[PDB]
């Protein structure tokens, strides 16, 4: 009766400690991103393997657009402009010779004539993009009636596919310009100590329960090499040779 409480307590412990490991804390490693980089306003490369970030945020002040050539340029991109499907599955802030416009995966999120953003009114271009929202919010300028020129499409399937922060600009970092993405590193975790203890305890308890069940099955009068495991046969020789030959 002393070896029947073992096979009970060490069998329930190894169950309540093993049905509770996929609920205990882990330690995730979280990566971020932020161009500029070295304060030099050049392209970089970051080929996300999940093909999409968690967040995205661009600021793009107004002086950057005011100080561009009469040609368009791409003040801020996510894939190279000449990619295979770059207009699709990417985000652009193009500043073409007639208008500024923030685009997305083949949808025009916002568009404003250039002679309006080139005015003392506009201040920056916030291009946040997260779960359930892809708005474009040109600060400064006002929609004709009363709105501050915001955009929409709250579709959560509009996050751009990121392979870099390619830009058509050269020179030192102008103040205000700031991109920021959040990479989806959710699978790269490591267990805490409160989870290693639970794993070790579950395994030790399920070993002790089996040892006690073994010691309990021997209340019959038994406990503790035949002639089959001692012979060798032509069949065994053939099978061993035909396995070793086929392995090579």
């Amino acid at each position: 009766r002393g070896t029947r409480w073992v096979a009970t307590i060490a069998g329930l412990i190894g169950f309540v400690l093993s049905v509770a490991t996929p609920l205990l804390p882990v330690v995730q490693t979280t990566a971020m991103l932020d161009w500029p980089q070295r304060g030099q306003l050049g392209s970089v490369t970051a080929p996300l393997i999940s093909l999409t970030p968690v967040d995205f945020t661009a600021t793009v002040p107004c002086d950057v657009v005011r100080a561009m050539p009469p040609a368009g340029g791409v003040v801020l991109g996510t894939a190279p402009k000449q990619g295979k499907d770059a207009n699709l599955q990417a985000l652009f802030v193009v500043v073409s010779a007639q208008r500024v416009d923030v685009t997305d995966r083949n949808v025009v999120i916002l568009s404003v004539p250039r002679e309006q953003v080139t005015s003392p009114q506009c201040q920056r271009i916030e291009v946040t993009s997260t779960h359930a929202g892809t708005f474009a919010n040109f600060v400064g300028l006002k929609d004709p009636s009363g709105a501050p020129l915001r955009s929409g499409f709250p579709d959560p399937n509009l996050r751009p596919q990121i392979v870099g922060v390619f830009t058509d600009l050269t020179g030192p970092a102008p103040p205000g310009l700031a991109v920021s993405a959040t990479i989806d590193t959710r699978f790269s975790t490591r267990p805490t100590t409160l989870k290693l203890l639970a794993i070790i305890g579950a395994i030790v308890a399920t070993v002790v329960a089996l040892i006690a069940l073994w010691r309990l099955d021997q209340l019959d009068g038994r406990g503790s090499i035949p002639a089959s495991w001692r012979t060798f046969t032509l069949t065994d020789a053939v099978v061993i040779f035909g396995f070793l030959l086929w392995h090579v």
């Binding site: 330690v27 979280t30 991103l33 490369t45 999409t52 190279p80």
Partner: peptide, 30 residues
Amino acid sequence: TLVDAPPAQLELGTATRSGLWSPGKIRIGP
């Protein structure tokens, strides 16, 4: 390569999660 662009610095850190936390769904299609 299409554009001459060097790799990026990644701004790493750590955070202790739980067994039921999730930052949202994965964008698998339109």
